[PDB]
């Protein structure tokens, strides 16, 4: 049964490849050669947020852009005030290891995931007293790699035992589960309409997931290694993925295959995070040789290098209005770039 | 209004800074340890007033490459072992030759003293006579024990360069305490560039 089913899968994958190849008419470079390039704009460090002790593993901006949340490994979750470099709230963490942090679009909830398999939700308003754990989502059996909010009530989480899950807070149970990959789901990003979330895993697979349905519509296999971090193009029609083979690839949703690949011979280190600018002409990628090369998104050129850090950059965030870029590295410094 | 909010923000920022100072003091007092043979189990103890938080992975899937990278900050990894021995050797080599684990010292424990079939290099082996065999035992057990220790040493010496060290031991808390003190003293000598 295995041999005939394997033959059928081989035939069908060949059909999907042939169909994508027939739909492939050009590369993005051929048509977009006639555009003015960015040239070079280097950025200047403007703020330096030094309050952490251990390495800063994840940072998340807020929709207000006044405030950012950063999570270290010393068990401290700190809500910085990026304009006036002050610490609004510092929160103690029950478990030392925290691999992600998420900040709500209302600015009332902060979600931190660790190795302890328990997503925690912190209420910020708290007229009774301090910020405190309110409800904790404990369903996964691997670890929790990334987490994101859809609204104040429902939170999507990417586990490390292959099952992405959609969570409800006031009940506490998984509304739905996503079971597509064969690997550790590293990072998920959300579309700007918040109906579809891409998933990055360790089997070099990018998948498109529908939130209400719970099925993977598409599969993007163009990487040679695991996908560290994934970011949508800011309209919701494409996305970029970062891997450990020193390639950032731009994947198209509706043409279903890779538009462009950002890789140069002098780069032999893994991408840890990818992000876009406001318009999307600039692609920001954190690299493992301690700097953040900036990529011209339509021309595949290196616009500039953000070389302020001293250790591995772990997280990289861009504000909603696009004013600044804040990178976080393992030397316990958040550098805000303009 | 503005004066009140700035003064209040100064007070809140100073209170948070003082809390971070207290946390820094207790954090530096703490020597984290990793034991690899609820997603994570914590064992806390203290030997001569020095606090050791030891963490053991709980229900973690067997693929190890992603989550281990977080553990580079640790002082030492306690590695306990018992064709199982070859898998343990391959694991130790992977930990030793990682791009991020070059600063962590590995502390090695040889539990369940042993076999002979899997290693046709064992027949050509002689006991290290610089070392002192522990009395009241079996010559074959001693020969096998030192043979396994030598295999771990040969894996260790490949591109070691003094960045991090491997300590081999036999079966427990005092041994870990002495080894952690040794690692800290070597790290301090490296800072002053005496070594």
């Amino acid at each position, epitope marked *: 049964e295995l041999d005939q089913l394997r033959q059928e899968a081989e035939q069908l*994958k060949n059909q999907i*490849r042939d169909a994508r190849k027939a739909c492939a008419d050009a590369t993005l470079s051929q048509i977009t050669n006639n555009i003015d390039p960015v040239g070079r704009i280097q950025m200047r460090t403007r703020r330096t947020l030094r309050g952490h002790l251990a390495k800063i593993y994840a940072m998340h901006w807020g929709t207000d852009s006044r405030l950012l949340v950063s999570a270290s490994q010393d068990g401290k979750l700190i809500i910085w005030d990026s304009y006036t470099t002050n610490k609004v709230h510092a929160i103690p963490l029950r478990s030392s290891w925290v691999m992600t942090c998420a900040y709500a679009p209302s600015g009332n909830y902060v979600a931190c995931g660790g190795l302890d398999n328990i997503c925690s939700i912190y209420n910020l308003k708290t007229r009774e007293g301090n910020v405190r754990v309110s409800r904790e989502l404990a369903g996964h059996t691997g670890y929790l790699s990334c987490c994101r909010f859809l609204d104040d009530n429902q939170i999507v989480t990417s586990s490390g035992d292959t099952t992405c899950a959609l969570w409800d807070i006031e009940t506490g149970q998984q509304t739905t589960t996503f079971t597509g990959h*064969t*690997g550790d789901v590293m990072s998920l990003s959300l579309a700007p309409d918040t109906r579809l979330f891409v998933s990055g895993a*360790c*089997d*070099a697979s990018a998948k498109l997931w529908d939130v209400r349905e719970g099925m993977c519509r598409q599969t993007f*296999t163009g990487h*040679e*290694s*695991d996908i560290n971090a994934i970011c949508f193009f800011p309209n919701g029609n494409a996305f970029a993925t970062g891997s*450990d*083979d*020193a390639t950032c690839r731009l994947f198209d949703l509706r043409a279903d295959q890779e538009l462009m690949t950002y890789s140069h011979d002098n780069i*032999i280190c*893994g991408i840890t995070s990818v992000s876009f600018s406001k318009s999307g002409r600039l692609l920001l990628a954190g690299y493992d040789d301690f700097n953040c090369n900036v990529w011209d998104a339509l021309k595949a050129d290196r616009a500039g290098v953000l070389a302020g850090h001293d250790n591995r950059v772990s997280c990289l965030g861009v504000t909603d209005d696009g004013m600044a870029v804040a990178t976080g590295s393992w030397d316990s410094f958040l550098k805000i770039w303009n | 209004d503005q004066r009140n909010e700035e003064k209040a923000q100064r007070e809140a920022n100073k209170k948070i800074e003082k809390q971070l100072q207290k946390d820094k003091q207790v954090y530096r007092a703490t020597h984290r340890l990793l034991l690899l043979g609820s997603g994570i189990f914590e064992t806390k103890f203290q030997v001569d007033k020095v606090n050791f938080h030891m963490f053991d992975v709980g229900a973690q*899937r*067997d*693929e*190890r*490459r992603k989550w281990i990278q977080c553990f580079n900050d640790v002082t030492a990894i306690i590695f306990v072992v018992a*064709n199982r021995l*070859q*898998a343990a050797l*391959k*694991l130790f*080599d*992977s*930990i030793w*030759n*990682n*791009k991020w684990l070059r600063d962590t010292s590995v502390i090695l424990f040889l539990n369940k003293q042993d076999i002979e*079939d*899997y*290693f*046709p*290099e064992f027949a050509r082996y002689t006991t290290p006579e610089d070392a002192t065999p522990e009395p009241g035992e079996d010559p074959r057990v001693t020969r096998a024990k030192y043979f396994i220790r030598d295999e771990f040493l040969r894996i260790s010496t490949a591109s070691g360069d003094g960045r991090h060290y491997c300590y081999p031991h036999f079966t427990n808390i005092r041994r870990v305490f002495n080894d952690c003190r040794d690692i800290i003293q070597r790290m301090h000598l490296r800072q002053y560039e005496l070594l």
Partner: nanobody, 126 residues
Framework: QVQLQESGGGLVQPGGSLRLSCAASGFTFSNYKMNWVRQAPGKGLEWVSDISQSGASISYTGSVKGRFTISRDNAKNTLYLQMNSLKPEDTAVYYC?????????????????????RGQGTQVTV
């Protein structure tokens, strides 16, 4: 799309010179330290041999010393295993595998719970 295919195997007279060939498609071959992993039936996966990025660093399991030869060519991008003087108790499925990152030395691919980049294997009966 990354897949490792294996050609060879089958019944062999004990002692027979059977060769296993792994064909790599979907990645740059010259950058990955590629290894062979075998699963005996009713037994977890066990590493056999590995060869480095160039073809200089070669290592074996203790039980397969001096009987198995591992050689890699970059141009035909194939991981080639030569087995000589076989034994009936060492019969197993043989999986071609790839260590997950370029330009590195460490590997984490003994894991039976579906490592993402190994091949599907060939039964090899002695």
């Amino acid at each position: 799309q990354v897949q490792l295919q294996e050609s060879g195997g089958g019944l062999v007279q004990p002692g027979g010179s059977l060769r296993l060939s792994c064909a790599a498609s979907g990645f740059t071959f010259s950058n990955y330290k590629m290894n062979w992993v075998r699963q005996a039936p009713g037994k977890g996966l066990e590493w056999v041999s590995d060869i480095s990025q160039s073809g200089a660093s070669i290592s074996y399991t203790g039980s397969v010393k001096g009987r198995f030869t591992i050689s890699r060519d970059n141009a035909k991008n194939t991981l080639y295993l030569q087995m000589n003087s076989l034994k009936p108790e060492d019969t197993a499925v043989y999986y071609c595998a790839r260590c997950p990152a370029p330009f590195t030395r460490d590997c984490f691919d003994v894991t039976s719970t579906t490592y993402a980049y190994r091949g599907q294997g060939t039964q090899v009966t002695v």
